[PDB]
Design a protein around this motif. Sequence first.
Motif: not given
Length: 16
Positions: A5, A7-8, A10-12
């Motif tokens: 993922c 550069n986001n 919340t997703c990591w």
Amino acid sequence: PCSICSNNPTCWAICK
């Protein structure tokens, strides 16, 4: 396995 993922903030953290 944790998904690549690019550069986001919340997703990591949800990797089990």
